[PDB]
């Protein structure tokens, strides 16, 4: 009896796909449940609305994104990642009755990024330094980063930056910065393209960006129905360095390895999955 099947969705990129396959591998080995991974399912609002609607069951959400985008009104949080997790976990349970499991170790932040040659040429070390050259350089940003208070709106409001911005599809912005259509983009800190393309990350000197650590987000009612999901997925909690996650993103995203295979090999190596 009772092989219930779980929809596990990613945001856009190798990393949510890798994390979703990690959830699927853990759930299938350790529970009576199957999982289906939905790669590139959405951006943050679509995953969040789909999770509330029951059109998906689990996706990885990140701690500053719960506080900054999902919680309304957004709370004023410290820059300590542990405190930022507890605010995100308690807030989203209160607001929406989502259960937000314990975060992994690594942070994947938004990172205002330029070519290394561009930072050398224009004296750019911090995000404040872009105010020197905000009429000399063009940015390409993801639409959600433009849409987000901790994104380009934060670049305006906290930094006073009015960048010349083209909106980009997320899968195209790294190639645009690498080819030279743009000179600034909203990198993600564990993205393999940062090292691959010799991008240098501008320092967040006013600290616009909160901590972002990933964790499973699910409805409380699913976790009431399947309380073993908490023990099983919290295997990942406090685990996976930034350097480990970047290499997994390289394996899927750059070497074109399948995300289930990269996920399963990592968890086996890490002692978290069989064989
Ligand atoms: C991890 N992150 C860098 C903090 C972002 C990345 C992201 C936002 N939208 C999509 S798609 N990806 C997020 O998940 O909110």
Residue numbers in the entry: 232 to 506
Paper lines:
Here we show that spd_1642-1643 in Streptococcus pneumoniae, a Gram-positive respiratory pathogen, encodes an ET uptake ATP-binding cassette (ABC) transporter, designated EgtU. The TMD (EgtUB) and SBD (EgtUC) are fused into a single chain, denoted EgtUBC encoded by spd_1642. EgtUBC is predicted to contain six transmembrane helices in residues 1-230 (EgtUB), followed by the soluble, extracellular substrate-binding domain (EgtUC). The solute binding domain (SBD) of EgtU, EgtUC, binds ET with high affinity and exquisite specificity in a cleft between the two subdomains, with cation-π interactions engaging the betaine moiety and a network of water molecules that surround the thioimidazole ring.
Two structures of EgtUC-ET complexes were independently obtained, at 1.82 and 2.44 Å resolution. The 2.44 Å structure of the holo EgtUC contains the wild-type EgtUC residues 233-506, while the 1.82 Å structure, termed EgtUCCTT, has the C-terminal five residues, GLLKK, replaced by the pair of amino acids VC. The structures are virtually identical with a pairwise heavy-atom RMSD of 0.206 Å over the common regions (residues 233–501), and we therefore use the higher resolution EgtUCCTT-ET structure to describe its features. The structure of EgtUC includes two globular subdomains connected by a hinge consisting of two strands ≈10 residues long, with the ligand bound in the cleft between subdomains. The domain D1 consists of residues 233-331 and C-terminal residues 445–506, while D2 encompasses residues 341–432. Each domain is characterized by a five-stranded β-sheet surrounded by five or six α-helices. The additional electron density found in the cleft between two domains corresponds precisely to that of L-ET, with the quaternary amine oriented toward the hinge and the bulky sulfur atom close to opening of the binding pocket. As in some other subcluster F-III quaternary ammonium compound (QAC) binding proteins, notably Archaeoglobus fulgidus ProX (specific for GB), B. subtilis OpuBC (choline)42 and B. subtilis OpuCC (broad QAC substrate specificity), the aromatic residues Y341, Y419, Y443 and F293 form four sides of a pentagon and contribute cation-π interactions, while the base of the pentagon is formed by N339. The carboxyl group of ET makes electrostatic interactions with K242, T296 and R379.
